[PDB]
Structures are given as structure tokens and as C-alpha cells.
Design a binder for this molecule. Structure first.
Ligand SMILES: C[C@@H]1CN(c2cc(-c3n[nH]c4ccc(OC5(C)CC5)cc34)ncn2)C[C@H](C)O1
Ligand SMILES: Nc1nc2c(ncn2[C@@H]2O[C@H](COP(=O)(O)OP(=O)(O)O)[C@@H](O)[C@H]2O)c(=O)[nH]1
Lengths: 1485, 121
């Protein structure tokens, strides 16, 4: 514009008032562009005159764009611009704090940017920048806002990697003019725990001898130096502080034990878990400190044992030596207080007889993975013993002799005979694991009554023979692990007596209440089962019904008694061919038809029928039958040569029946084959089933005649109306499942289809461009509702539907001998979902070819190669990344369909060769061979100079659908499957820790898994970025592992069980809020979790007001964390409620599996929960105690959404309220005092009288009684109805006109409509305020006044509060409460005022609204709505600092409530933290 | 009006200036503000007769309800203005606000027993 003027003000900085005319600036943008900020700053800092200051500020108001004004101002370190601009708004935006820290500056500026709001990551970056530069002031204030916890009285310091620590850094950590300018411009407009986890401290010698904080830290009582790099800890420091009793310095690099650290005053929980102390750790003698409780001296070079404990320590409860190098036989160990000791992973051959026969209270001896063969006389005090994975040949007799054994796990042992309970002598057995062992007998009939309390018995991977029903005498059993036996194949009916079992591991050995109830029914009544399925099969129309007549549309189900077998006359017309695999059950025996009149042609043409039979029911014998012998019998030659058991199903017989004569032989052979079936050696034509099933079958058969002929489909209650048998709720599902397996009725879901002939004649009646049709329902009224769902899902009509540079595309083949029966009509139905907008897809009977663009297409066809007898599908897809994703997804769908519908095909030739074609410049390649060639990432032929990347040709094998950023580098990762490098177990595998381009990045190693489940897990885990989600870094294929981030402070279960005192009232809510946010994101992504529990929630930092505190771990149920009906969608919310219940409880629902394991599941079936506060004694916490009750509703349709529960958790009222005490109905109270006392009668409460003081009383008659019209009291002051006073009657200074308020903060008060102060000092008239607001408010009684820098006046029945200056003695102004109310029934009449030292005033309206205000900025914080209907009295009480609120729930119900003193600060903190979290979530993508 | 929302005749009625309210009437008789207060409500609060009966004769609502559901009868009973109470009574007693108290109840809490007898019969 004009730089001449700015050049003039450049000189005008020191010039006279001539600069005032420069007025002309505000008379008329880019004014501040060059130097305007600096000139105005010399102006207002030039010994500041008010006349010029006002015009300068008026000109400056045009600037308020605002951010860039600060950015130019923030360039030069200057507190006045800092404070003024922060008051005007505009600090963590660009950053700015980092550059101010980098530039030389003063503490005041950085303190302003810190306390005005700054992103945690930016503050950490600025701190790391400033660490290198020598400084002791700016970093000191940075720590104040970065890592200080006054609420917990502790100073954490974790992830922020500081180079070293020095005493001057933690100085203050251990315990104006701008406002005037801003206001007028606006008008114109003892530490306990110290954490040093991740700070790579090479040494700690800095603050060792004597410093500023050495005396301050002398009573620290908790110090953390873990994960550090310490060595040779200085003995000077341990003498320096004489109160430390929680020091845990592990993962450091030590050489020899200090032995002077134990010379500490009173130290406990000394933990060195990874320090490499030398071979000998013998403690120095002559030091008797009886304070150590837990001693984790683990993972060391200790060939011997610490043979110093017996002489020195007297209370070494948890003396642990797990994983040491302990080789020799241990000393007699004369300690007399050892409670829990571990010797796992040591090298121990045996123990001496006196090795353990010294401690009288060893209760938890355990030595896992040791070469142990004998166990020398454990003292009787032991209760839990873990001796798994040892060289045990038989259970040592000493174990049989201890009286009070509770839990014993001797897994991974090679013993032969386990002793009977008549030798155990212990009736309190709880858990007994004996997996990985060679046990053949389970003799218990000797004495079973001794075993009554056994809960979890494990015998997996054992060569058992049979289960004796005597084990049914066991009652408290909960989990019987009998899987992998492969030798039992039976179940004694007495198992039904064990109703307490909720899990059963049956895998490869041949749930919960269903199996046990079935066994109970069989025990009550068992009858032989005589019903089999005989599915006759034909080809294009032949002697099918004629053969049945001697012995077509749909399947024509018929019953044929002889046992009884039902004949299913399947269809011959190819059009009906789509639905047939739905009825080819595994337990049946199929016929066939030759029609020998056609000779050699027909037997080969009918081969696909046997192919389909082999694919569906491989273990089903077949009876081949000719049906045209009347009219060339050489077909027997090919039947014996090629059609035999070579590749096609297990043919058992073939006949040449005429149509008579050979029918007798046919019938005899059918009976012989059906009787001798032996499906997996079971003879299932004569199996045993409960008579309840047979009675139900008879009931259904009888009801078949008595049913609507047109629609014989009965309702869900129609089964109930039939029953007079005895079947409970759980019997019906398994019963109908068995009946459906027996071919009596169909049920897949509120309707039961009886008379399957009608269903299979009508549901397939629809069969009788081309292939597409719209709604054209004819023949047969409310049927369509389920008819469309049944028809579309089972059978647009897919059936009968219209029968290139070679390097940029990828092709795959899945060659099969023939296409299975219902293959395409289901594959094309499944491939209507795949996507990275509706694509275009011209799909014919055997193809799809769905595409969005030339860069996104997928073509699945029906390839017919030259000189190729069998048919196969070819799939083509462009070699782009999106194409690779599509290929992976579609091939996953293909193999899922194959494994879920034709198990016979993919059963180890294998009849399914998955070819992958490639071309260096096409060449066949087996997918199995390609998978085997995973040792490298490049495939090359015998000729070496040419090669192809693996991902280019097999994108499904090596991760290419996933982002290329998820690609682990073997040289970086160090994932070793060690038994301590793991962090926990979960779902389909476990998680470990390893170094990978970082500190300790976790690795999820997979267990038996497959690259088909791996694909799904990777695809769900990736492409999902959220602050509450545990994001993964990389993936590898060599272990086939994942890489994840670290929960720095552990998992929530460990937090609850170990450190229950570290959970603050703001920490529990923060964890709940973040878990709710993660669940909200999961639901918004349409993914269920059903896994919420303390074991699954991970904590990062224990700093309350952080940005990331809790996250939700792996997500694809639990006895203690069960869903309402799914585990015993909206089911996630109920699991969330259980998580909230325990967090509120702090370890009640958990730690309830040891005294009553099933009690965490056996009382929450339908809305039954104990009251948490009374049940567990935890601190009361309403408005979330009601939230859990209102969220975990029994009706899933009544439970709120995850977004709604997150929103309700996002409220400081839920965080600040601590009590809500009710009062008896129809009782009114008008006054309370500082237990709590209330108001001719009197009321009292523990957590007509007018007003009371503390003990004083007084009623409408103003009774001057002496106990231990009065209108106001204080504490001694008394006010009457016509302006009197009392200094008791020491003095009565009459001023009246009733006195009604007296306050102190020289006291102040009110009388009528006039304020006094004191001997009356200043009686300022207040009625003269009618120019603002109504005159009626000014001319009214004054109810309450509070004393501060200003004076706040509240008058009765007024919606406006007045402010009068204390010194100026003039009306400073009015604050209109209704204006706040209108922004948000509302009354607005002020009833009481309360003042807080942080310049926050809380005003109680007549209605149920509490207005928060800030005196510094005169801005509303919020309105406390929904609270009550009235508010009468508020006053601060030092319980914790909290001020109560009284109200009526008008029907009259008076209520009391307690709010935290930090309500506005908490509101600001929560509002800042939610915004920061939202910004982080936005930035994650 | 003003930023909060009120008309000058409201101030005139509350301050009891007869000439000003009369000359302004010669605006809205039932003008309601952001509080919902009526000029009749303010006149009853101040208890200043002639504006009360003039506004009642001018067409002011007999049972106008403010934000707090208080009638001018309620305010007159509350502040001890019995004369306003009967003046409104012959202009046409069971009306309840959200809290649900008649002017009888207001007289009861404030002790205006003189207004209490008038309201019952
Ligand atoms: C105290 C110790 C415990 N720790 C952890 C870490 C984790 C953890 N991190 N990342 C994970 C990713 C997945 C994960 O899936 C679970 C919940 C299935 C185990 C756990 C973690 N879970 C417990 N504890 C980390 C170390 C340093 O500290
Ligand atoms: N000549 C002769 N014809 C037969 C014989 N068995 C069946 N058919 C013919 O097959 C027809 C019956 O077909 P059907 O069994 O209902 O069909 P499908 O079982 O579904 O294949 C009749 O019309 C007969 O003419 C036979 O033994 N000899």
C-alpha cells in the first residue's frame, strides 16, 4: 500500500506525540505486514499517556489474521505480546513453541505458551531440541507441563528419551498489565514415585551426594530406574535417601551386585530382573535389614544360589530366582519366612532332603522346565505346586503326602500311572493339569468321594483308553480336557451329572451345556436309534421311480419302513441340479442308475454324479445299480477298471437289476450295506439316542397329518404347543438338529418345515436376457416375507443363465476333475460383494468379469484348455496393487467355499491342483511348491540370471494386498520365542517383544494357523487408524508374524491386580473414555469385538491428563466377561458394561475365579448384578453407576449405542460428581451447615427453623435460644427482619429493611437493598441502578453477597447479578444470567453464589441450572442442566474440597448433591483433551 | 428494543412513570420480553396502581405467563401488593407455573396473610 507511513512510525518509536496522528491508520488488512507490531509495542511499552493509549488500542483493534499477527509477534521473545495475544485467543498452531524454545528467550514466554495450551508431541519435540543446548530454566518449566502429577504427588518420566538427568532439572517439580490491555481492547472490540523408565541414563551419579533436591528426595519412598542403562549403582545415593521402599531397577546392564543398596534404611520390592550379576551374588554380611518383601533377582549368571539370605533377611517372602543359571544342588536354605519361591528355567538335577525342609511357610514352590526326577519332602504348608516339564517318571510320594494341595500341573512329563485319590489324602484339589503325558488308565472307582473339589482337569495329548463313569462322582469339575486322545470314541452318560462344566475341548477326539444335557437325557432314557437316509440318484431321467416302486420334480421325499430308511428321489433334470448338495448329508448311503440300454456312453456320462458324491459325502458307500436289463453288459468292464475306488467314492457293490427277480438280491444287499455302515467305526444305524428325540419325532409325524395342507410350516411356538414330553429350552436346538440330520423336518429361523416333500416341491417349483426375472409371484398371501429370503439364499436366477500384454495381468488356475454340483450358482452369488460405487459385471452361467475401470477388474471364467479332459476355472486380474487386493479377496472366498462345502475335494493328487502361471518374458507352477519356496523373495529357474519377484506372481502368498509399508526386514527384527520375551497370550496365537528399528517393539507370533486366517486378520487389523486402536508396524512371513506397539505400563489386568492404588478418579474415567472411543470407531467400521476384558485393554502412560492412555488389543467368549446371550452388535455394549463394573470395582469381578470360578458367569444370565459400592466397598461414583445399569439392559434393543455411551462419558459432570444423597419424600429443607446438618424441627445427615450456623439455630420468630425474625447468620453475626445486628448480645449495630447476607473474605453484608461493610464503614446505595435492567430488580431484597477483588451482589428473585467496585465504590456492571440460559421451564432467578480461588464463580439459578463463570475473563464455563428443579443453598465444604448443592425434585422430594471443586478446570481439561484426540484421529489418516 | 430484548414501555411501567407509559400507549399492550415479562408483570412487581388498571383496560393479558410461569397476580401476591391482587381479580386463581404454586402459596411463603384471605374466597 504505502511503506512511507510505516517508515515514518519506524522513526516515531522514540519520537514525540507526532505518532498519535498516525488515528489515520484506523480511519481506513496488510498494515501489520512489515513492522507494525514492533512499532505499537514501543508505543505501549514507552513508559506506560492514557489518552494516546486508548487511541492506539482502538487502532490496534482493527487487527483482530489474528494468528499471523501472533506469528510475527512470537518471532521476538516478549511477554507482553505473549500474554495479550493469548488473552485475545489465537498457541499450538502453525510449530511455535519449538522455535521459541530453540531461540534464546526467557522463562516467562515459554511458561505462557505452555499454560495457554500446547500439543504434547510439540512440547516433547521442543524439549528434545532444548536438551542439547545447555539450560536449566526453560526445560524446568517444560517438565512442569509435560510430566508432572501433583494429584498423585508424583513425577513420571517415561517415553521422552532424555540423554541424562541432573538435579537442577527437577527443582520446582518437587513442591496483570496485559489483562487490563486485553479487557479494554475487548471492550473496544512430598513426592512419592519417580519414574525413569525410557530415559537412557548411562549413569545416575549426577544427583548422588548433595544437591538442591537431595534433601527433598531423601523421603521419596518410590524410585524407578527400570529399562535403563545403569551400571555399578552408587552407594552414596542409597545413603542419601532413607525412605525408598519400592525401587525396581531392571533391564539395566549390571556386572556385580551392589550389596550396599540393601543397606538402605527400609527398602522393599527390590527388583533386578535382567541385570547380569556375576557368577556369585553372595551378599555382604553384617547387614540385618528386615524390610525386603519381594526380591526379583532373576535372569543372571548365577551358577550357584544366593547363599546369604538365611543369615541376613528375615521376611524375604517372594524370593524368586526364575530363569537363572542355577546348576548345582541348592543349600539347605535355612530361611524361616520364605512364602513364594520360583526356580523355573534353571538347570537343576535334584534337591537335597534338607533343601526345602527348613521354611515352615513355603506355599508356592515351583520349578518349571528343569531336569527334576525326585522331590524331597515339601513342608505341609504348601498349597500350590508347579512342576511341569520335568524328567518325572512317576509322581514322587512326597507330593502324595502333603495335606493341603490345591493346584498341581505336571504337564510335559513322561509318567505311566497316576495314583488314585485314596493316596492323595487332600480333599481341596482345585486344578490338575496333566497334558503332554502318556497316561492310559484313570482308575478312580477306588475312592472317588475324596475328589469333590476338582475344577479344571487337563489330559490333552494323552493315550487314554476309556473314561470310567466313576469320575462322574466328581462334582465341582469345570473343564475336562480330553482332546487328542484319538482312542476313546465314547462318552459315559454319567458325564451329564457334571452341569458345572462350561467348556469342552473336543478337537480331533470323537458344546458346554448342550453336550452335557444330551448326556443327561441319554442317561435318563437311552433307546437305540433306527433311522437312516437312502438317497437314490439318477441321470436325465431313467429308471428312478420305477426302481423305488419295485423296492420327476424336486426330490420327492418318501418314507420306507422295513430300522426305517427314507428314500430321497433326487431330480434328473439339470435345471434342478443347483440345490441338490444341500441334501447330500454325510451319514447316508447313495444308490445310482445305469440305464444299460445306453451302454458304455451312459456309465461315463453319469460319472459327475459320483464325483459330486465324493465331494460332498466321501465316507458314504454307494450301490451302483443298472435299471435296463430288459433290453451289451460290457459296462461291467469299465465299472471294474476305471469306476472303482481309484478316485471316485468308496464303491461297495454294483448290480444289474432288471426293473421281479433280482429285486430280492437288491433288497438283501441294501439291508446288508445299511446295517454294516460303521461311519468312522460307529455302526450308526444302531446308535443310542434319548427317547425324548424319538417322542418328539413321533409328535412331529402325528402333527404332519393335523396341519394346514397348503402351508404345513409350523411356528416356533407350535413345537412348544405340542409338548407331553420333557424338554427344556436347551434341548430343543440340539433335538431339531438331530431330527434334521435324520431327515424328518427342516429348520435353519422361527419356522419349522414339516413334510419336507412340500418344501422341496414348492421351493424348487420356481425352476419350472435369459435367466433374469423380477418379482412375478403367482399361485398359492404373506408367504413372500420368508419365501424370498429362503429362495434367494438357496437358489435373478443363477441357474440356467445364458450357457493383455501377458505381463501386466496375473492369472490363476484351480483345476478340478469336474465342476462340483452347485458350484457356480453359489460362487457367483458370493462374488457380489467384493470391492476395494457399483461396478459393471456381465456374468454368465460360469463367469463374472466384474470391473470398475481398466485399472480394476476381475474375470473368473470356465477355462477349457486344449487336450485337457477335466474342466477348470481361470481367474485374471490386473497386476496393480488394487488388483492384487481383489485377487487375494476372491481367492480367499474361493478356498473358503471349497473348505465349507466340499471337504472331500481338498482332502489329501488331492483332486485339486491350484496352478499359478508365470512368464519370464506361460509356465505352470504349483501353488504348494510356490509356498514351499518361501525361503527367498525371488524365484529363479535352473538358469540363474533371470528371476521373478514372489509378490508379482503370487500376491496372495506374500503380503502385497496389504500396504507395502507393512513389510518386515529380517535384519532388523529379533523375534525369539523365549518364555519371557512374550508379553501375553490371546486368540489365535501369542505376542512377544523384540528390537525392530526401535526400542522393544512387540511381535505377535502365530501358533496350526494358516495364510487364510492370516489374510483376514491382516486385512481387518490394517487400514484402521485410530488413537484408541493398537496400530501395527510391520508384518513378516518367515515366522508368519505381526509387529505391534507397546503398552509401556502393562495391561489393565496387571494394573488392577498389582497396583490398585495407582488408579485415580480421573484415570479410570480416561481409560473408560478411550475404550469407549475405540469401540465407537469399531462400530462405525461395522465390526464387532465381543472381547472386552481387563486382559485385552492396554495402558501406555499413567499420566492422567495425557493424550493416549488406553487402547484395545487384538480383535478377530469369556466366563467372567460374557455377553448376555451370545456368550451365555449391541452385545459389545454389555461387555463394555462389565469392563466399567470392574474398573469402578477395582478388582472384584476378577480375583473371583479362585474362590468361586463359575460365580462370574452363573449370576448374570439376565440382568442380575450386585450393587458395586455396597458389594465391594469402593469409593461411591454416581452418574456412571447409573450408566452401567442403564447400559447393560437385558433387552439388547433397549441398550444405548456405543456412540451414545461415548457421548455420555464425554461429560465432566460424570467425572466431578462424587455423591448424590436423597432425602425422605415430602420433606423440605431451607438451610444447611458445614457430617451435614440441616433444618419447629431439625434434621441431620451423615455421609420452622430458618437458618443455622456452626451450633446455632433460629426460626421465623427469631428465638434467641442457647444451644450447642432471624434472617442471616455467620461464624458471630445475626440479622433480623428489619435491619439489626449482633456480635454475640455483645453489640447490636442497627442499620434498618431486612439484613439477609453476611460474608467474609473486614466482613461485608447486605440489608434491604443496601450493602454495608466492617462499626459501619461504607453503606453504598444499590437501588440506584434502574438505568440498567428493570427498576424492580434494583428495588428488591438482597439475598447473598460474596467478597473478592470486586463485589458481587445477588438480590432475591432476580435474573441479574450486579458487580460493584470495591475501591471505586461504583456499579462496575451487570451479568445477566438469562442471557446464558437463552443460549442453551428455565427460571434464571439467582438464589445463591459461590466463589472459587481460581476466579470461578458458580451461580445457582431458581431452576435446575448452575452457571459456571470465570472472573478473569467474564465468560461462562457451562450450564449444569438436567440436575434438578430448584437450587437453594451452596457452600464450600472441606470433606477433599467440594461444595454441596440442595434442591427439590418437585410431589416434593428434596435432594442433596456434591460436586468437585475442580469442576471448571476439569471441564477445560476434558474439552482440550477431546479436541486433541479428535485432531490426532484426523491426522492418523 | 435492546440487545437483551426489552421495550422502553417495560422500563416506564417498572419505574412507575404514568405520563410516559400513557403517551407510548397512545405500542404493544402485551409486549413480552426475553424474560417473558409483561408490562403488567412489572407494574405488579412495583405495585403502582394506575398503570396496572390502565394496561388491564388497554387489553393486557389477564393470565399472561412469563418464562417462570408467574402471572401478574402471582407477583402482586408475592410482593405484598394486595391492591394489585384484587384489581387483577375483577379482571378475571388456580393457574400454576412449572413449580405449580397458586398466588395463595406465594402469599403463604412470604407471609402476606392479607392477600391470603382475599385469594381463598
Ligand atoms: C509390563 C510389561 C507388559 N507389556 C505388555 C504389553 C502388551 C502388549 N503390548 N502390545 C500388545 C499388542 C497386543 C497384545 O495382545 C494381547 C492383549 C494378547 C496379549 C498385547 C500387547 N500386553 C501386555 N503387556 C509391555 C511391557 C514392556 O511391559
Ligand atoms: N424298458 C424299461 N423302461 C424303464 C425301466 N425302468 C424305468 N423305465 C422307464 O423310465 C420311466 C420312469 O422314469 P422315472 O423313474 O420316474 O425318472 P427318474 O427316476 O427321475 O430318473 C418310465 O416311463 C419307464 O418307461 C425298465 O426296467 N425297462
Amino acid at each position: 500500500l504505502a511503506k512511507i507511513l510505516v517508515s515514518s512510525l519506524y522513526r516515531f518509536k522514540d519520537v514525540a506525540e507526532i505518532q498519535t496522528k498516525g488515528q489515520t491508520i484506523l480511519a481506513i488488512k496488510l498494515l501489520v505486514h512489515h513492522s507494525f507490531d514492533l512499532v505499537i509495542f514501543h508505543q505501549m511499552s514507552s513508559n506506560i499517556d492514557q489518552q494516546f493509549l486508548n487511541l492506539c488500542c482502538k487502532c490496534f483493534a482493527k487487527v483482530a489474521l489474528k494468528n499471523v499477527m501472533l506469528e510475527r509477534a512470537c518471532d521476538q521473545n516478549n511477554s507482553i505480546m505473549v500474554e495479550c495475544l493469548l488473552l485475545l485467543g489465537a498457541a499450538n498452531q502453525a510449530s511455535l513453541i519449538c522455535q521459541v524454545c530453540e531461540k534464546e528467550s526467557s522463562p516467562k514466554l515459554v511458561e505462557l505458551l505452555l499454560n495457554s495450551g500446547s500439543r504434547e508431541q510439540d512440547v516433547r519435540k521442543a524439549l528434545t531440541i532444548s536438551i542439547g543446548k545447555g539450560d536449566s530454566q526453560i526445560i524446568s518449566l517444560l517438565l512442569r507441563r509435560l510430566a508432572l502429577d501433583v494429584a498423585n504427588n508424583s513425577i513420571c518420566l517415561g517415553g521422552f528419551c532424555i540423554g541424562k538427568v541432573e538435579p537442577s532439572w527437577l527443582g520446582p517439580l518437587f513442591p496483570n498489565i496485559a489483562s487490563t490491555l486485553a479487557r479494554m481492547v475487548i471492550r473496544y472490540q512430598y513426592i512419592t514415585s519417580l519414574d525413569l523408565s525410557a530415559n537412557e541414563l548411562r549413569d545416575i551419579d549426577a544427583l548422588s551426594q548433595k544437591c538442591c533436591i537431595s534433601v527433598h528426595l531423601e523421603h521419596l519412598e518410590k524410585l524407578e530406574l527400570h529399562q535403563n542403562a545403569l551400571t555399578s549403582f552408587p552407594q552414596q545415593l542409597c545413603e542419601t535417601l532413607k525412605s525408598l521402599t519400592h525401587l525396581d531397577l531392571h533391564s539395566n546392564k549390571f556386572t556385580s551386585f551392589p550389596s550396599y543398596l540393601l543397606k538402605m534404611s527400609c527398602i522393599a520390592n527390590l527388583d533386578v530382573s535382567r541385570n547380569d550379576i556375576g557368577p556369585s551374588v553372595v551378599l555382604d554380611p553384617t547387614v540385618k535389614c528386615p524390610t525386603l518383601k519381594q526380591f526379583n533377582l532373576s535372569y543372571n549368571q548365577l551358577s550357584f544360589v544366593p547363599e546369604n539370605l538365611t543369615d541376613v533377611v528375615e521376611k524375604l517372602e517372594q524370593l524368586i530366582l526364575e530363569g537363572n543359571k542355577i546348576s548345582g544342588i541348592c543349600s539347605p536354605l535355612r530361611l524361616k519366612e520364605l512364602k513364594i519361591l520360583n526356580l523355573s528355567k534353571n538347570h537343576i538335577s535334584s534337591l537335597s532332603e534338607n533343601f526345602l525342609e527348613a521354611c515352615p511357610k513355603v506355599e508356592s514352590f515351583s520349578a518349571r522346565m528343569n531336569f527334576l526326577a525326585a522331590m524331597p519332602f515339601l513342608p505341609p504348608s504348601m498349597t500350590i505346586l508347579k512342576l511341569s516339564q520335568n524328567k518325572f517318571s512317576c509322581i514322587p510320594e512326597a507330593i502324595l503326602n502333603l495335606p493341603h494341595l490345591r493346584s498341581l500341573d505336571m504337564s510335559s512329563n513322561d509318567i505311566q500311572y497316576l495314583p488314585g485319590p485314596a493316596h492323595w489324602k487332600s480333599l481341596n484339589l482345585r486344578e490338575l493339569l496333566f497334558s503332554h503325558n502318556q497316561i492310559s488308565i484313570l482308575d478312580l472307582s477306588e475312592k472317588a468321594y475324596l475328589w469333590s473339589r476338582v475344577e479344571k482337569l487337563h489330559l490333552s495329548h494323552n493315550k487314554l483308553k476309556e473314561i470310567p463313569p466313576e469320575i462322574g462322582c466328581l462334582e465341582n469339575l469345570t473343564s475336562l480336557d480330553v482332546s487328542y486322545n484319538l482312542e476313546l470314541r465314547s462318552f459315559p452318560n454319567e458325564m451329564g451329572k457334571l452341569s458345572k462344566i462350561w467348556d469342552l475341548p473336543l478337537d480331533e477326539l470323537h458344546k458346554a451345556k448342550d453336550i452335557i444335557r444330551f448326556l443327561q437325557q441319554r442317561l435318563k432314557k437311552a433307546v437305540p436309534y433306527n433311522r437312516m437316509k437312502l438317497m437314490i440318484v439318477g441321470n436325465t431321467g431313467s429308471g428312478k421311480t420305477t426302481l423305488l416302486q419295485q423296492l420327476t420334480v424336486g426330490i420327492d421325499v418318501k418314507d420306507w419302513p422295513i430300522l426305517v430308511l427314507n428314500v430321497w428321489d433326487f431330480a434328473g433334470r439339470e435345471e434342478f441340479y443347483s440345490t441338490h448338495p444341500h441334501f447330500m448329508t454325510q451319514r447316508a448311503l447313495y444308490l445310482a442308475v445305469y440305464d444299460l440300454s445306453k451302454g458304455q456312453a451312459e456309465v461315463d456320462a453319469m460319472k459327475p454324479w459320483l464325483f459330486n458324491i465324493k465331494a460332498r459325502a466321501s465316507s458314504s458307500p454307494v450301490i451302483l445299480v443298472g435299471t435296463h436289463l430288459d433290453v451289451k453288459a460290457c459296462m461291467s468292464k469299465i465299472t471294474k477298471e476305471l469306476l472303482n475306488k481309484r478316485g471316485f467314492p468308496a464303491i461297495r457293490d454294483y448290480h444289474f437289476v432288471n426293473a421281479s427277480d433280482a429285486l430280492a438280491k437288491l433288497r438283501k444287499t441294501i439291508i446288508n450295506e445299511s446295517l454294516n455302515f460303521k461311519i468312522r467305526d460307529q455302526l450308526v444305524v444302531g446308535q443310542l439316542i434319548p427317547d425324548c428325540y424319538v417322542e418328539l419325532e413321533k409328535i412331529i409325524l402325528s402333527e404332519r397329518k393335523n396341519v394346514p395342507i397348503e402351508f404345513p410350516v409350523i411356528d416356533r411356538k407350535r413345537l412348544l404347543q405340542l409338548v407331553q414330553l420333557q424338554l427344556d429350552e436347551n434341548e430343543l436346538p440340539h433335538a431339531v438338529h438331530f431330527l434334521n440330520e435324520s431327515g424328518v423336518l427342516l429348520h435353519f429361523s422361527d419356522l419349522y418345515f414339516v413334510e419336507p416333500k412340500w418344501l422341496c416341491k414348492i421351493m424348487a417349483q420356481i425352476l419350472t436376457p435369459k435367466g433374469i426375472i423380477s418379482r412375478r409371484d403367482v399361485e398359492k398371501k404373506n408367504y413372500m416375507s420368508q419365501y424370498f429370503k429362503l429362495l434367494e439364499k438357496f437358489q435373478l436366477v443363477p441357474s440356467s443363465l445364458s450357457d493383455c500384454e501377458n505381463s501386466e495381468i496375473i492369472i490363476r488356475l484351480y483345476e478340478m476333475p469336474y465342476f462340483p454340483m452347485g458350484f457356480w450358482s453359489r460362487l457367483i452369488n458370493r462374488l457380489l460383494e467384493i470391492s476395494p460405487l457399483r461396478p459393471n459385471r456381465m456374468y454368465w452361467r460360469q463367469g463374472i468379469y466384474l470391473n470398475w475401470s481398466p485399472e480394476a477388474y476381475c474375470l473368473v471364467g470356465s477355462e477349457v484348455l486344449d487336450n485337457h479332459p477335466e474342466s477348470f476355472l481361470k481367474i485374471t486380474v490386473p497386476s496393480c496393487r488394487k488388483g492384487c487386493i481383489l485377487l487375494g479377496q476372491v481367492v480367499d472366498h474361493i478356498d473358503s467355499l471349497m473348505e465349507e462345502w466340499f471337504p472331500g475335494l481338498l482332502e489329501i493328487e488331492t483332486l485339486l491342483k491350484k496352478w499359478a502361471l508365470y512368464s519370464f518374458n506361460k509356465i505352470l507352477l504349483d501353488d504348494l511348491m510356490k509356498k514351499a519356496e518361501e525361503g527367498d523373495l525371488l524365484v529363479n529357474p535352473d538358469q540363474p540370471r533371470l528371476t521373478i519377484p514372489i509378490s508379482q506372481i503370487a500376491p496372495d502368498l506374500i503380503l502385497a494386498d496389504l500396504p507395502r509399508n507393512i513389510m518386515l526386514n529380517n535384519d532388523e527384527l529379533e523375534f525369539e520365542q523365549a518364555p519371557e520375551f512374550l508379553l501375553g497370550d490371546g486368540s489365535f496365537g501369542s505376542v512377544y517383544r523384540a528390537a525392530y528399528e526401535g526400542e522393544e517393539v512387540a511381535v505377535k507370533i502365530f501358533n496350526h494357523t494358516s495364510l487364510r486366517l492370516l489374510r483376514q486378520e491382516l486385512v481387518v487389523l490394517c487400514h484402521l487408524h485410530h488413537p484408541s486402536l493398537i496400530s501395527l508396524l510391520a508384518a513378516g512371513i518367515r515366522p508368519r508374524m505381526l509387529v505391534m506397539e507397546l503398552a509401556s505400563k502393562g495391561s489393565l489386568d496387571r494394573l488392577l491386580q498389582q497396583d490398585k492404588a495407582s488408579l485415580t478418579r480421573t484415570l479410570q474415567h480416561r481409560i473408560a473414555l478411550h475404550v469407549a472411543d475405540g469401540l465407537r470407531y469399531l462400530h462405525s467400521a461395522m465390526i464387532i469385538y465381543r472381547d472386552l476384558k481387563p486382559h485385552n485393554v492396554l495402558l501406555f502412560t499413567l499420566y492422567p491428563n495425557a493424550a493416549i492412555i488406553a487402547k484395545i488389543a487384538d480383535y478377530g467368549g469369556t466366563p467372567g466377561f460374557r455377553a448376555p446371550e451370545v456368550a451365555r452388535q449391541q452385545a459389545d455394549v454389555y461387555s463394555f458394561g462389565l469392563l466399567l463394573y470392574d474398573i469402578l470395582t477395582t478388582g472384584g469381578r476378577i480375583v473371583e475365579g479362585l474362590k468361586f470360578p463359575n460365580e462370574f458367569d452363573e449370576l448374570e444370565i439376565q440382568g442380575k448384578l450386585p450393587d458395586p459400592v455396597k458389594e465391594y466397598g469402593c469409593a461411591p461414583w454416581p452418574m456412571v453407576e447409573k450408566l452401567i445399569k442403564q447400559c447393560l439392559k437385558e433387552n439388547p434393543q433397549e441398550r444405548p449405542t456405543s456412540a451414545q455411551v461415548f457421548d455420555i462419558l464425554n461429560s465432566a459432570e460424570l467425572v466431578c460428581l462424587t455423591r448424590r444423597i436423597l432425602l425422605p419424600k415430602n420433606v423440605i429443607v431451607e438451610c444447611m451447615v458445614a457430617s451435614i446438618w440441616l433444618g419447629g424441627q431439625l434434621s441431620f445427615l451423615d455421609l420452622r427453623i430458618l437458618c443455622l450456623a456452626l451450633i446455632v439455630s433460629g426460626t421465623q420468630s427469631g428465638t434467641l435460644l442457647v444451644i450447642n425474625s432471624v434472617t442471616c447468620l455467620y461464624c458471630l453475626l445475626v440479622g433480623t427482619a428489619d435491619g439489626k445486628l449482633a456480635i454475640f448480645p455483645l453489640k447490636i449495630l442497627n442499620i434498618g429493611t431486612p439484613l439477609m447476607c453476611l460474608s467474609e473474605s473486614v466482613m461485608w453484608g447486605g440489608c434491604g437493598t443496601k450493602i454495608f461493610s466492617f462499626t459501619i464503614q461504607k453503606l453504598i446505595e444499590t437501588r440506584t441502578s434502574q438505568l440498567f435492567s428493570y427498576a424492580a430488580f434494583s428495588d428488591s431484597n438482597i439475598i447473598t453477597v460474596v467478597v473478592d477483588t470486586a463485589l458481587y451482589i445477588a438480590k432475591q428473585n432476580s435474573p441479574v447479578v450486579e458487580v460493584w467496585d470495591k475501591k471505586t465504590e461504583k456499579l462496575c456492571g451487570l451479568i445477566d444470567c438469562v442471557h446464558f440460559l437463552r443460549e442453551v421451564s428455565y427460571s434464571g432467578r439467582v438464589k445463591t453464589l459461590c466463589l472459587q480461588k481460581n476466579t470461578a464463580l458458580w451461580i445457582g439459578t431458581g431452576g435446575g441450572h448452575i452457571l459456571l463463570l470465570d472472573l478473569s475473563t467474564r465468560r461462562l464455563i457451562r450450564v449444569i442442566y438436567n440436575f434438578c428443579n430448584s437450587v437453594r443453598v451452596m457452600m464450600t465444604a472441606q470433606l477433599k474440597n467440594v461444595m454441596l448443592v440442595l434442591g427439590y425434585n418437585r410431589e416434593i422430594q428434596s435432594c442433596l448433591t456434591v460436586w468437585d471443586i475442580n469442576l471448571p478446570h476439569e471441564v477445560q481439561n476434558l474439552e482440550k483433551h477431546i479436541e486433541v484426540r479428535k485432531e490426532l484421529a484426523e491426522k492418523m489418516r | 428494543t435492546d440487545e437483551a430484548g426489552v421495550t422502553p414501555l417495560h422500563l416506564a411501567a417498572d419505574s412507575g412513570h404514568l405520563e410516559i407509559v400513557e403517551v407510548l400507549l397512545k405500542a404493544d399492550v402485551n409486549a413480552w420480553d426475553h424474560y417473558g415479562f409483561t408490562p403488567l408483570h412489572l407494574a405488579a412487581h412495583v405495585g403502582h396502581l394506575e398503570i396496572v388498571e390502565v394496561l388491564l383496560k388497554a387489553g393486557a393479558d389477564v393470565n399472561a405467563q412469563d418464562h417462570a410461569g408467574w402471572t401478574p397476580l402471582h407477583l402482586a401476591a408475592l410482593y405484598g401488593h394486595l391492591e394489585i391482587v384484587e384489581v387483577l381479580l375483577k379482571h378475571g386463581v388456580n393457574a400454576q407455573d412449572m413449580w405449580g404454586e397458586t398466588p395463595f402459596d406465594l402469599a403463604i411463603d412470604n407471609g402476606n396473610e392479607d392477600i391470603a384471605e382475599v385469594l381463598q374466597k
